[PDB]
Amino acid sequence: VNSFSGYLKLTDNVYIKNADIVEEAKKVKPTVVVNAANVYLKHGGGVAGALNKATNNAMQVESDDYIATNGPLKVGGSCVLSGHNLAKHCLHVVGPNVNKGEDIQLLKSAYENFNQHEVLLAPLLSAGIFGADPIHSLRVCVDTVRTNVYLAVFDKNLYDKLVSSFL
Ligand SMILES: C[C@@H](O)[C@H]1CCCN1c1ncnc2[nH]ccc12
Ligand SMILES: [Cl-]
């Protein structure tokens, strides 16, 4: 039993809700919140910009130190940093950016990072400003993640479409 509430169940291990991930995180304070990061951990907009803003820029300060020490992430890769006031940990995951010509096959590699954590609150990856089709992102998620994932979908119309077309 966990404290996530109001989710539709898609499969044994994937749950979905029309919600702002920032609000879900503040309410639930999960062990892991996933950020839709870029390789530079520059949290400018979308999920990352909103999460960082909710931390009063502490996420960005921590991230800049991470990059100064370690260099950029790989597309498809991840790192575990603090969750600040939103969660115990933040798993920063880089999906491919289709607007940059990055290989959509890397979306599966991105989702594989979720399997290192028993339970996560997450957005769909590579959608939003990253350019990919959220319907495809959901199928990759369901077919790749085996741990328990609670997906927060910001837009109501998209949420309704993802549920209605789910095979
Ligand atoms: C797929 C879509 O859901 C992702 C990509 C674009 C924004 N977005 C978000 N999802 C969940 N919570 C959010 N809070 C703020 C933004 C946001
Ligand atoms: Cl985004």
Curated annotation (Swiss-Prot):
Kindly list the places in or outside the cell where this protein is found, as annotated in its UniProt entry.
Host endoplasmic reticulum membrane
UniProt domain Macro: residue ranges: 1-167
- Reaction catalyzed: Thiol-dependent hydrolysis of ester, thioester, amide, peptide and isopeptide bonds formed by the C-terminal Gly of ubiquitin (a 76-residue protein attached to proteins as an intracellular targeting signal)
The domain of life is: Viruses
Activity regulation note: Inhibited in vitro by GRL-0617.
Q: How does it sit in the membrane?
A: Multi-pass membrane protein
Q: How does it assemble?
A: May form homohexamers. Interacts with N protein.
Q: What does this protein do?
A: Responsible for the cleavages located at the N-terminus of the replicase polyprotein. Participates together with nsp4 in the assembly of virally-induced cytoplasmic double-membrane vesicles necessary for viral replication. Antagonizes innate immune induction of type I interferon by blocking the phosphorylation, dimerization and subsequent nuclear translocation of host IRF3. Also prevents host NF-kappa-B signaling. In addition, PL-PRO possesses a deubiquitinating/deISGylating activity and processes both 'Lys-48'- and 'Lys-63'-linked polyubiquitin chains from cellular substrates.
Q: What is this protein called?
A: Papain-like protease nsp3
Q: What is the lineage of its organism?
A: Viruses, Riboviria, Orthornavirae, Pisuviricota, Pisoniviricetes
Which portion of the entire protein is included? 1025 to 1191 of 7096
